[PDB]
Structure 1
Amino acid sequence: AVTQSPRNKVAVTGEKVTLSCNQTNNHNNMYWYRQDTGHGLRLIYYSYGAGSTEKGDIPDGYKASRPSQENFSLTLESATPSQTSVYFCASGDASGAETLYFGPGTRLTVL
């Protein structure tokens, strides 16, 4: 339904990291979240539809791109240790009050 890549990633401070997200049901909405203990899931960036991008609650250090309807990617231009968490991408199903379906997630560690 929604797949992410890579599943596991270790970067060094300053490395440029791109997380890739692919959905297969063509929903207009896609979201990028990071999950941290004590914070649960926080929105970084989200997309209302192809060719557009919107800042989430904690976008600093990130940028995202929605070239198409099926793909939404998240990029960490210069990775910092604080970006070390689990990233989850999700598409929004409007027919269910925007019920989300997440990809497996990307475990990113910044050394």
Structure 2
Amino acid sequence: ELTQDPAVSVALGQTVRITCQGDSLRSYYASWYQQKPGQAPVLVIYGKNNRPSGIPDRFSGSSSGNTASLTITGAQAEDEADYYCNSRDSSGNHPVVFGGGTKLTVLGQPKGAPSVTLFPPSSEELQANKATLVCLISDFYPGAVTVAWKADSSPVKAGVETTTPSKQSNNKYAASSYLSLTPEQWKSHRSYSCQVTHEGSTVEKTVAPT
């Protein structure tokens, strides 16, 4: 069993040290991986201070006794990710153990308003006696947002499915919301609206049957 801190934060341009602690580390070296949301883990440290090709030299590794440390000198925005240490157990037949992970937050990144795009139901779905409204939200930072739907000028609240925010490749966030209606309901109102609020400011997009 290897222990890590669950959350560590660093400001842009400063140095951070992620620790990995375990009794097995007295016998075998520690490797490190970086993982960004929606991707596979990437090896950054074989062990000691040896890195694969392609890993910038701002990453460095060290170890002593029962602890190992990954050090990032001069953190940049692309270093925001999860980090796992990994080694070989010293007891028994030596299974392989992982650390719990460390979510590394980089401070000082720029804010951003959400970009909203609302699609009305397609003619093919209506002919199949169904109707979906698609509200696509992207490029907002920080990653907190609230979505509300409106039939004409009234809240609907029924048939709404909204995803949790996920981090894009540019460290900003995206989300989506779906409103499922019957073809009768879509044609018996004059408009529907998707209202997206972020950091106190709201963006409202409206569609209409035509």
TM-score (norm 2): 0.44
CA distance in 2, matches of 1:31, 1:73: 10
Name the structure 1 match of 2:75: 79
Which blocks of at least 5 consecutive residues in structure 1 are unaligned?
none
> Deviation digits for residues 31-78 of structure 1, max 9, x if unmatched?
11111134311111132xxxx43113553121111233x221000111
Name the structure 2 match of 1:37: 37
Name the structure 2 match of 1:21: 20
CA distance in 2, matches of 1:91, 1:62: 18
Query: Any runs of at least 4 consecutive aligned residues in structure 1 with deviations exceeding 2 A, and if so which?
Result: 56-59, 92-96
CA distance in 1, matches of 2:23, 2:54: 26
CA 15–31 in structure 1, closer or farther in 2 if over 3 Å, else same: same
Q: Which of 58, 64, 68 pairs up with 1:67?
A: 64
Q: Flag the structure with higher strand content.
A: 1
Quote the RMSD (CA, aligned, Å). 2.1
| Number of residue pairs aligned between Structure 1 and Structure 2 | 103
Instruction: Give the number of the structure with larger relative contact order, counting CA–CA contacts within 8 Å between residues 6 or more apart.
Output: 1
Tell whether the 8 Å contact from 1:45 to 1:57 is kept in structure 2 after alignment: no
- Max Rg structure: 2
TM-score (norm 1): 0.78
CA distance in 2, matches of 1:40, 1:2: 21
CA 3–35 in structure 1, closer or farther in 2 if over 3 Å, else same: same
Which blocks of at least 5 consecutive residues in structure 2 are unaligned?
108-210
